[PDB]
Swiss-Prot record, chain A:
It comes from the Eukaryota. This is Coatomer subunit gamma-1. The coatomer is a cytosolic protein complex that binds to dilysine motifs and reversibly associates with Golgi non-clathrin-coated vesicles, which further mediate biosynthetic protein transport from the ER, via the Golgi up to the trans Golgi network. Coatomer complex is required for budding from Golgi membranes, and is essential for the retrograde Golgi-to-ER transport of dilysine-tagged proteins. It comes from Mus musculus (Mouse). It is found in: Cytoplasm, Cytosol; Golgi apparatus membrane; Cytoplasmic vesicle, COPI-coated vesicle membrane. Belongs to the COPG family. Oligomeric complex that consists of at least the alpha, beta, beta', gamma, delta, epsilon and zeta subunits. Interacts with ZNF289/ARFGAP2 through its C-terminal appendage domain. Interacts with EGFR upon EGF treatment; interaction is essential for regulation of EGF-dependent nuclear transport of EGFR by retrograde trafficking from the Golgi to the ER. The coatomer interacts with KDEL receptors; the interaction is important for retrograde trafficking of KDEL-bearing proteins from the Golgi to the endoplasmic reticulum. Interacts with COPB1. Interacts with TMED10 (via C-terminus). The gene is Copg1.
From Swiss-Prot, chain B:
It comes from the Eukaryota. Oligomeric complex that consists of at least the alpha, beta, beta', gamma, delta, epsilon and zeta subunits. Interacts with CAPN8. Interacts with SCYL1 and PRKCE. Interacts with COPG1. Interacts with ARF1 (myristoylated); this interaction is required for binding of COPB1 to Golgi membranes. Interacts (via trunk domain) with ARF1 (via switch I region); the interaction is direct. Interacts with KCNK2 (via N-terminus); this interaction increases the channel-mediated whole cell currents and promotes plasma membrane expression of KCNK2. Interacts with STX17. Interacts with TMEM115. The gene is Copb1. The coatomer is a cytosolic protein complex that binds to dilysine motifs and reversibly associates with Golgi non-clathrin-coated vesicles, which further mediate biosynthetic protein transport from the ER, via the Golgi up to the trans Golgi network. Coatomer complex is required for budding from Golgi membranes, and is essential for the retrograde Golgi-to-ER transport of dilysine-tagged proteins. This is Coatomer subunit beta. The chain holds residues 309 to 469 of 953 of the full protein.
Length: 112, 161
């Protein structure tokens, strides 16, 4: 309900809060395809900023992986990628950051 | 124009004609600009450029742009193209300056466009000055646009360690 409605019940501000929370929660509650499905959408919206949250939430999530995620988790960041300079940069950088640590290690430091 | 035997001169006479444009009507003007761009094998250029600069001054003036603004953007496009081909010069520096003066996004977008481009183009030298120029501009200024500007530039970085 939240997901859907909020989508078409708007307000960016809400998203900030919820994002943050969601950010922690991920794969302890599974339903991956859906959740992904959502996540993509959330990003769908413009705003470098709106887009950005899906990646950040993801870090706790990614790290944990779910009912299918690690392989693919690795595949995805690749599949979804962006320019728009500082938006480019965000993709690049997260990557670059990613680039910079053994992704397993990477996850551990950053997450905390 | 498909008199592709296309004589030198003719291209050249344009400016004269173009002068008339100062008695505006953008829409007409606009048609001109496209038209204009074409002839230049990166030449009859300077005289023009100069003239452009004249335009530029003219553009300053006191203005109450409403139509001409548009023109400016266009001009810049028209202008942009040339440069690609050309080796260009001080004139260009001036845009940079000019741009600093200005206050609306579309230009920033162009600028940015330039950011991109230039990032590709790198013969560099100019940039550095400009970067300096910019440094001034920057010091000299505040805004989201700027704020954004900083970001990329910052991103870019080099010397004066």
């Amino acid at each position: 309900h939240l997901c859907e409605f909020i989508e078409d019940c708007e307000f960016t501000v809400l998203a900030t809060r919820i994002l943050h929370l969601l950010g922690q929660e991920g794969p302890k509650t599974n339903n991956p395809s859906k959740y992904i499905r959502f996540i993509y959408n959330r990003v769908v919206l413009e705003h470098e900023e709106v887009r950005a949250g899906a990646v950040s939430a993801l870090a706790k999530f990614g790290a944990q992986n779910e009912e299918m995620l690690p392989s693919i988790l690795v595949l995805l960041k690749r599949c979804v990628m962006d320019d728009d300079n500082e938006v480019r940069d965000r993709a690049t950088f997260y990557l670059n950051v990613l680039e910079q640590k053994q992704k397993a290690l990477n996850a551990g430091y950053i997450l905390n | 124009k498909e008199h592709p035997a296309h004589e030198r001169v003719l291209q050249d006479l344009v400016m004269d004609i173009l002068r008339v444009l100062s008695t505006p009507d953008l829409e007409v003007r606009k048609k001109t600009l496209q038209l204009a761009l074409d002839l230049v094998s990166s030449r009859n250029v300077e005289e023009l450029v100069i003239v452009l600069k004249k335009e530029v001054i003219k553009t300053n003036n006191v203005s109450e742009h409403e139509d001409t603004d548009k023109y400016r953007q266009l001009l810049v496009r028209t202008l942009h193209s040339c440069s690609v081909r050309f080796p260009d010069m001080a004139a260009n520096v001036i845009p940079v300056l000019m741009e600093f003066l200005s206050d609306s996004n579309e230009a920033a977008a162009a600028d940015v466009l330039e950011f991109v481009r230039e990032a590709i183009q790198r013969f560099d030298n100019l940039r550095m000055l400009i970067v300096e120029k910019m440094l001034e501009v920057f010091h000299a200024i505040k805004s989201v646009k700027i704020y954004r500007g900083a970001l990329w530039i910052l991103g870019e970085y080099c010397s004066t360690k």
